[PDB]
């Protein structure tokens, strides 16, 4: 009858950078989503492959909680079938995703006068990520035929960049905290049930 540790993921003081997105495995617990939708700093919740109305009455092998910060107008990329810098190069959901995406404006926490540069994203990559692939390499990106040998220069770019959130940003450029809940149904005993 132990409730799942949802708060540990939603109430964190600092979130992960999206390219380095954090995963927490959740299992052997009772999933009370009301501790989540009564959170107050709880703003949006959209599920795929399952209805929220059915969640209290389903069981899953595991629940993974992936968390990171992106900017507001990038949240639409955290969805099946999307493209763009985040879905292509930073965090990719499968087309047949089963789970829920939770997001809220974190301008009061994650922006700073003069800019918060702690949150990073991958800007350059040669190919799209597979679903749930994580790439944390910092290799100098070779944009032409000349090898970089670790040296930054023309056609040789550091692959990451900072958001630099400022409180005066328009809402599309403000930080959003995101938690992705993946509901795993393997051929195994179910350890996460919500009653």
């Amino acid at each position: 009858t132990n409730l799942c540790p949802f708060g540990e993921v939603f109430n964190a003081t600092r979130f992960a950078s999206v390219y380095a997105w954090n995963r927490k495995r959740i299992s052997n617990c009772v999933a009370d989503y009301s501790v989540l939708y009564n959170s107050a700093s709880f703003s949006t919740f959209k599920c795929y492959g399952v209805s929220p109305t059915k969640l209290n009455d389903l069981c899953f092998t595991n629940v993974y909680a992936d968390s990171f910060v992106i900017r507001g107008d990038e949240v639409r990329q955290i969805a099946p079938g999307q493209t763009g810098k985040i879905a292509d190069y930073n965090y990719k959901l499968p087309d047949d995703f089963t789970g829920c995406v939770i997001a809220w404006n974190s301008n009061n926490l994650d922006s700073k006068v003069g800019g918060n540069y702690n949150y990073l994203y991958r800007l350059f990559r040669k190919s799209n990520l597979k679903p749930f692939e994580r790439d944390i390499s910092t290799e100098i990106y070779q944009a032409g035929s000349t090898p970089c040998n670790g040296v930054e220069g023309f056609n040789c770019y550091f692959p990451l960049q900072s958001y630099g959130f400022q409180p005066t940003n328009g809402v599309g450029y403000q930080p959003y905290r995101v938690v992705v809940l993946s509901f795993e149904l393997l051929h195994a005993p179910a350890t996460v049930c919500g009653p």
Partner: antibody
Amino acid sequence: VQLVESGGGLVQPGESLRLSCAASGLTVSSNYMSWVRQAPGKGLEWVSVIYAGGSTFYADSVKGRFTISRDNSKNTLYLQMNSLRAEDMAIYYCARDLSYYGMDVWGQGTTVTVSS
Amino acid sequence: MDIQLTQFPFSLSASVGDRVTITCRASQGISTYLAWYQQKPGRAPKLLIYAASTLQSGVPSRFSGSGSGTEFTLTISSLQPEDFATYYCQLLNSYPVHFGQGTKLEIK
């Protein structure tokens, strides 16, 4: 480092045209590659981009009529333009986009004239 | 909504050696996501400034960019004869790529 556009010319409204952009000194398939156009006497207008990973995006004014593509073995970018209209009359520039660092490399563009 | 960028002055006359400042205004806060381009008639634009204040490599040091949020400026310390051109600002890090509609800098 060179970007060299070709394929511009005179068209009637409703006809189609394919532009090419041949690159030397950067790898088209490894970059954000954009087309940006400029109508006679007007400002710059972004048209389309293709990501290194293959995603494509389009200005609303060309969605459904323009298709961007590339050929890695030729190191060449393309813009297929269908159902051309008066408002597509412009010089079309090919550009390498570094997205945070701006568009640092441009060709000198190819002219599309739509007969009145 | 979409960001819109607006440039002023629309046209400006100035003399060789003058100091000129031109501005770009964003319809909402865009941090430092602004680039400046110089364009001679019929030529490709040339990148001058990215991230609102970082000089592109090889650009003369009389060009400088300033600003954050919604108000951005491009300053030329001491105008040279080759500096007369139309200048454009561009929203960075977004593919619905948005441009200003230009400031035309003419000789006085």
